[PDB]
Write a protein that binds this ligand. Structure first.
Ligand SMILES: [Zn+2]
Length: 209
């Protein structure tokens, strides 16, 4: 039954228009978000609500386990539209604890198409096999990998020529890593923010055009 969603929508739009009749009209003229959110599709991690933003504030990409790949035009086109056209000032890479995509990459079941999508998280589980091994429970291993994943994705975003070229032309842009607790509603900073070319390892730095 989808009628509740349509009924909800009418109520919501109507309510907003009563408080500010021009709300949507004004918003529709130009798109000017300061932030891009890159997060998981997980239904429990809705971008705007978690950081108290309004329609218009947050350009959003969500995919399984918030994975960023330099050959994926889907995520990359969102990044590029955000950085080049909208000139967002911040990219918020937000993973979450208890991520099922991350959990899947730690185990050995085939889930189908998603198996290949999660490869890079599986790579992370392998390079940190010794670290993860020294954690007693599965829940801890999942959650630590969730964090490691976010930090890796922050690196991946910051290494894109999209981001580096923004910096090259003097555009101000920071890439942040955060993690959301589905258990407590808390959006936490992993404090791995990258804001300039000088923070990249030499092997990843790209010269200007
Ligand atoms: Zn997830």
């Amino acid at each position: 039954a989808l009628q509740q969603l349509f009924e909800n929508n009418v109520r919501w739009a109507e309510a907003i228009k009563q408080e500010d009749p021009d709300f949507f009209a004004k918003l529709a003229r130009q798109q000017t978000p300061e932030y891009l959110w890159i997060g998981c599709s997980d239904a429990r991690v809705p971008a705007n609500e978690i950081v108290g933003m309004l329609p218009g504030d947050l350009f959003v990409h969500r995919n399984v386990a918030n994975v960023v790949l330099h050959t994926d035009l889907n995520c990359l086109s969102v990044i590029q539209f955000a950085v080049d056209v909208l000139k967002v000032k911040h990219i918020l890479v937000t993973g979450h604890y208890g991520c099922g995509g991350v959990r899947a990459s730690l185990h050995n079941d085939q889930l189908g198409l998603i198996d290949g999508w999660l490869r890079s998280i599986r790579d992370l589980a392998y390079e940190y096999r010794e670290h993860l091994e020294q954690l007693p429970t599965e829940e801890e291993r999942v959650d630590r990998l969730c964090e490691l994943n976010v930090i890796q994705q922050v690196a991946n975003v910051s290494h894109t020529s999209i981001v580096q070229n923004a910096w090259h032309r003097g555009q101000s842009l920071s890439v942040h890593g955060c993690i959301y607790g589905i258990k407590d509603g808390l959006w936490k900073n992993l404090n791995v923010t990258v804001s300039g070319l000088d923070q990249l390892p030499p092997q990843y730095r790209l010269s200007p055009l």
